[PDB]
């Protein structure tokens, strides 16, 4: 028993998306739920779709642009959204309706942007002449100006695995920005060489940035 969602999806405002959810038990016996979870938000019931009669029911804020398809013979319940707006990016889950939301899916994360696949700018960050007032020393790599997600950021191809902190991407200027820091002892900082490797799948961009 399990529900498998589709996505992730990149959409520009205006297009429409059709998200799927397929299953493993007697499909038509149980209806289907759709839930919209927005980022720093909780879960909200968008609505149902009755599997046998094809009669859907909508939460009142999800009337109009949202519609419920379903293709019995294959065992997929759809959910398309027309006139995609900013408001719409979030993970969407499907859980069958029972004595509670029985089985859920993995969710499908929809992003709406009208921004193009952009490569990143890795700039290295360093103390410079700042006298290290500690036995630890810290470095960073700034990944700004990219789209979409995500970028994988390592230090020395993984060899520097501890001391590292890679911060969550911030959407500013309609493109992303993240940063990472490594913290190494006062001695292997400059003599040894510390470098950060960024790679952006979308744009086949991978670059190494050595530090001061």
């Amino acid at each position: 028993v399990q529900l498998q969602q589709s996505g992730p999806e990149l959409k520009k405002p205006g297009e429409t998306v059709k998200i799927s959810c397929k299953l493993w038990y007697t499909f038509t016996d149980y209806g289907m739920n759709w839930v919209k979870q927005a980022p720093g938000k909780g879960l909200k019931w968008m609505g149902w779709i009755q599997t046998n009669t094809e009669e859907p029911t909508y939460g009142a804020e999800f009337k109009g642009r949202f519609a419920f398809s379903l293709e019995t013979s294959a065992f997929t319940a759809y959910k398309q959204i027309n006139n995609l707006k900013n408001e719409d990016m979030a993970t969407y889950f499907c859980a069958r309706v029972e004595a509670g939301f029985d089985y859920w899916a993995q969710g499908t994360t929809l992003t709406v942007s009208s921004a193009k696949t952009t490569p990143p700018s890795v700039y290295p960050l360093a103390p410079g002449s700042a006298a290290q007032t500690n036995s630890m020393v810290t470095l960073g790599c700034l990944v700004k100006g990219y789209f979409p997600e995500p970028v994988t950021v390592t230090w020395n191809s993984g060899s520097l695995s501890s001391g590292v902190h890679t911060f969550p991407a911030v959407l500013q200027s309609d493109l992303y920005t993240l940063s990472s820091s490594v913290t190494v002892p006062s001695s292997p900082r400059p003599s040894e060489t510390v470098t950060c490797n960024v790679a952006h799948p979308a744009s086949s961009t991978k670059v190494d940035k050595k530090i001061i």
């Binding site: 879960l43 029911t57 509670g100 939301f101 859920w104 700042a130 940063s179």
Partner: protein, 211 residues
């Protein structure tokens, strides 16, 4: 409508511990109250339905109880998987409604951070703009806040703070705070300040370089 309110959005306990999460509804929901679990990778899972029925696959460490408008989920032998976010929902009427959730983060000692200021990279400079980066790492509890006071200027406008999650290994957080602007607007101020308010002190920790 019918709202579900969870007393506290966040909660901090230790392993082996025992904790109780509340959820009160806006009006008598008979006993149509279910509990679910969301884990950091987004997956959700039914835990208890109809107030107190343990779902197939859920350990006996979970328990529910309640009536009328108040219910409680009690987790008794706190384990490492149980540090996720929990939700309540009513099955009494459409629209189905859930509560804001409540997240379990592991409790621990206090730790002020290790603060570091990084002056804008040359390669960037020689392009168009200049981002100042302030890293504040490995501190507890999560609450800290910062103002960019560049000698009588608070650049709250055009700042990007960013939060990490309770580091697996040592259970703290870390925050980046980037102050990105233009070569022009940087090349006239030459005096950038990074202020940081955290429990451990009353003295607002400030870090800088001035050129």
């Amino acid at each position: 409508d019918i709202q579900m309110t969870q007393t506290t959005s966040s909660l901090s306990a230790s392993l082996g511990d025992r904790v109780t999460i509340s959820c009160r509804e806006s009006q008598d929901i008979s006993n149509s109250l279910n509990w679910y679990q969301q884990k950091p990778d987004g997956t959700v899972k039914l835990l208890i339905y109809y107030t107190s029925r343990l779902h197939s696959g859920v350990p006996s460490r979970f328990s529910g109880s309640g009536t009328g408008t108040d219910y409680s989920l009690t987790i008794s032998n706190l384990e490492q998987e149980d540090f996720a976010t929990y939700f309540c929902q009513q099955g009494n009427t459409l629209p189905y409604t859930f509560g804001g959730g409540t997240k379990l983060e592991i409790k621990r000692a206090d730790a002020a951070q290790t603060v570091s200021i990084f002056p804008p990279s040359s390669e960037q400079l020689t392009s168009g703009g200049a981002s100042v980066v302030c890293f504040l790492n490995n501190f507890y509890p999560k609450d800290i806040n910062v103002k960019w006071k560049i000698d009588g200027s608070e650049r709250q406008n055009g700042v990007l703070n960013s939060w990490t999650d309770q580091d697996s290994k040592d259970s703290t957080y870390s925050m980046s705070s980037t102050l990105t602007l233009t070569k022009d607007e940087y090349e006239r101020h030459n005096s950038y300040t990074c202020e940081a308010t955290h429990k451990t002190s009353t003295s607002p920790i400030v870090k800088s370089f001035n050129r």
